Amino acid sequence: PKTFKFGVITVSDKGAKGEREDKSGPLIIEELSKLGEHVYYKIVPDDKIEVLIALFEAIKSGADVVVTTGGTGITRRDITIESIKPLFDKELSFGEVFRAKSYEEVGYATVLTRATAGIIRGQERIVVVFSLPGSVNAVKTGLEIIKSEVFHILKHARE
Template sequence: MVLVHERDVQYGVAIITVSSSRFEKHGPLKGKERIPEDDESGREILKAFSEKVVDYYLVPDSVMEIRSAVFDALRKADVCILTGGTGLNPKDLTIEALKDLFEKEIEGFGEIFRMQSFKEIGYSAILSRATAGIINGKVVFCLPGSKRAVILGLEIIKASLKHILSHAKGLA
């Protein structure tokens, strides 16, 4: 279904996996061909957007590292999808790193994500801080690190991405 304000926009996608444990195991990784086998969530995003993926980053749970990767990614991509670091653990810093940078937060994304999560996992869905926002006319999605959560998030993203981009770029 094409929405009234949706345009056929061209876009590239950057994937950022936020995981201190994976970072300790593999070190810093950059490039879509470098997604580790054990990064199931990153691989799901790659599978969903295949030819649209322009870059991949593996970073630790660090506000500075997350922000640096996002700023670098947004130089090449119109869409940045982060996975990991969105939980309630004190070490989970993805939301803290990015929320203040959002020019506009897309609250509906997190609301729909939690609603759909509730259907699958019940009240544990309240633990999710999944969110999205606009930075410099580009869209940033923050998803939990689990493969199942990423698959759910991708379903929502794929259904609404062109519409969101049309608005973010002032085309709608």
């Protein structure tokens, strides 16, 4: 499991309408660029169709791993996990390990921390999706785990 291609999607109404700069997307790009090859980045509103268009473009572009940031919370606009999780053929224990680490950093606020990861399979092909919260700091923490484990996950995901 020597290298991989990866895409990045940031989900926010404000980011999408250019009213906030996205720092989370670029942090994932920079951090994963040490381990593999960036091939896709897009910002999309908090919208199930736009999120899924972006997930499948990233996959079309070759991404073996895709990380989304944003839309994981409990508001009415938040649809990231509801849109993506039903496509999984295997679900990983990411959210759980993400929460144990984030406890150190936010304690009982992890009750509101939502984050997941899964494998979408084709006949041969495998994609790992990680969905992180929108904050820069949430993402920074997520990345430590992704960097550490992404190779291990790919090796096993590929039979």
